Amino acid sequence: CPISFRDCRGTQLGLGRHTMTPATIKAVKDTFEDRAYPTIFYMLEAVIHGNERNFCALLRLLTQCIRGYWEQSHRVAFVNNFHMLMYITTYLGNGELPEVCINIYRDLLQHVRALRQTITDFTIQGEGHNGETSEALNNILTDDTFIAPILWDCDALIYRDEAARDRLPAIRVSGRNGYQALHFVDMAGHNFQRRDNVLIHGRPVRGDTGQAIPITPHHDREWGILSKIYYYIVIPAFSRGSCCTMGVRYDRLYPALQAVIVPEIPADEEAPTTPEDPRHPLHAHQLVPNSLNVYFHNAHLTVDGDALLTLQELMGDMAERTTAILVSSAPDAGAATATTRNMRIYDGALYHGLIMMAYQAYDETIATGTFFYPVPVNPLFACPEHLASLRGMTNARRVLAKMVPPIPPFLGANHHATIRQPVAYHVTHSKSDFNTLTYSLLGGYF
């Protein structure tokens, strides 16, 4: 399957369909090959771990942060996450943000929507068998069996294990089968060093937590479809396989989060805004070593005392610890026969994992491997560069890793998985455009 063939077939597929403006594409570039992306953004992404309540709880700080980050290099941020940018679009649309960033987000999201529409178009509706929709029987991005690399609420798993019903499913979560998915974990039950197979589903905005209440998905069916298409298209579309996914360590992360140096402002006086005032949180007289304020000041971002106080409400809900999820399935009825039942497929994914843009190893501000440990599970997301963050990093491992993507067997062998090496080669070595590459990859996924 020549690369030129893939590009041309994508070009045909993207004949009359939408494309991004040069502004958006150059912005997303400037973002991704910027190694100087401040890590505190990853920190807040991890701590909120895609909870809609968490997002709704931090309006002011988030808007001021994205503002100051953009009106300093015209670079957009937060791009990797699936469950924040659309949260911005849903909520941060009154007009408070600069029109350029929100327009970029709108353009990219409706482009993703048009990709979904394209997948709808080139299939025929009305052809179901054994309870499977034609959409799922044609493409893999629409089959709820296949999952995204990163999952933060078990709703996708709920869709998966309600969907197949004929494919024999098997889920391994640190050995023993099955999950429990206890939601809305507090301070009194943090247990960062917890070994059980429970899952953190989050706090639904409109509902009652309870204890015997059965788990409820936080979103609809096609939310997962958008997640899968976004992850498997746009990120490979721009990173060109440079990015990587990995886990975090809340046991050391959370303790660093309490350092708040907000001053007890005198009552009924206007809050300082410019950083030059010692009363301002960003000012040096309120700058103390080993604190969140210096973490921000490294990124040179102006923030207000109330926004920093908002973290005290933020710590209402905790995130327990990253884990590995292995899902196995049989081929669907489209390829179901007497000899392929045992002939199954497996896939590994990260729960509460996170993806960073470009590996960096040359900063004195933060030591190596302080918060994150590089755990990629994808031929697509191979990150031989990121492996330098791993403890006990040697030379032989690095030199041999350039020519093989290291994926642990408990996370999925390449041959038995969906994404194989050749498509990774294609996405990493096709240098034609970006919209064309998006369409080519999308067309591949049949």
Partner: protein, 49 residues
Amino acid sequence: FGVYVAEGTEDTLDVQMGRFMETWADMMPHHPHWVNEHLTILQFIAPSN
């Protein structure tokens, strides 16, 4: 390296991946077959492969 699938060992994935890392140091006795995808059609269809 490309056919074997293991199970979770009830850990924080820190020790797991690290141990897998040194294990992968000597697990490779030769060049894996699925690495030379950069080859074009010709030498691929050549009888040597």
